[PDB]
């Protein structure tokens, strides 16, 4: 009992493809894999015990010789989304926060992973939306899907609004 049992990830994976309907419906998926290092680990595990949890499958991922664990979700709302993030931050240590002004959503992100202890580490999201981007802060690839590619050692806002049918249509 009590090992030297501490590892860094160096080089490890996290990408965070999401993808909403505008019918405030949220699906996606959060994979954040990493190295093994150690035979113990077949996926360093998110720590996601959330209270939609019949929603949101997380499992292990083992893939391109990573292992750790993803987390696809389907069939969510818009008030499911922070509790949802709460989840990958456990494996991301970034902050994202969505907001509804009127009938458009505002999507606020920070990623300030600069004191960071690998320089490999990737951390990607992609937001896939079949609707249309008003103003985002970021890379958008089409007018309904936005990437942005979160760098170590840097600091990055992210950023996304889209124009989105509110439940209770309000303004």
């Given at each position: 009992g009590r090992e030297n049992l501490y590892f860094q990830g160096?080089?490890?994976r996290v990408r965070a493809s999401?993808?909403?309907?505008?019918?405030?419906?949220?699906?996606?998926?959060?994979?954040?894999?990493?190295?093994?290092?150690?035979?113990?680990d077949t996926g360093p595990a998110l720590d996601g015990d959330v209270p939609f949890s019949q929603k949101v499958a997380v499992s292990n991922y083992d893939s391109d010789?990573?292992?750790?664990?993803?987390?696809?979700?389907?069939?969510l709302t818009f008030a499911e989304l922070p509790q949802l993030a709460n989840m990958n931050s456990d494996?991301?240590?970034?902050?994202?926060?969505?907001?509804?002004?009127?009938?458009?959503?505002?999507?606020?992100?920070?990623?300030?992973?600069?004191?960071?202890?690998?320089?490999?580490a990737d951390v990607e999201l992609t937001v896939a939306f079949p609707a249309?981007?008003?103003?985002?802060?970021?890379?958008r690839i089409e007018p309904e899907v936005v990437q942005w590619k979160?760098?170590?050692?840097?600091?990055?806002?992210?950023?996304?609004?889209?124009?989105?049918?509110?439940?209770?249509?309000?303004?």
């Open positions: 160096h080089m490890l999401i993808t909403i309907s505008p019918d405030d419906l949220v699906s996606g998926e959060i994979i954040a894999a990493a190295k093994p290092k150690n035979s113990k010789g990573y292992v750790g664990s993803q987390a696809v979700f389907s069939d494996a991301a240590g970034v902050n994202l926060s969505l907001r509804r002004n009127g009938n458009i959503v505002i999507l606020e992100g920070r990623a300030d992973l600069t004191s960071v202890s690998d320089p490999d249309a981007v008003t103003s985002t802060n970021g890379d979160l760098k170590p050692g840097v600091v990055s806002t992210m950023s996304a609004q889209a124009r989105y049918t509110d439940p209770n249509t309000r303004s």
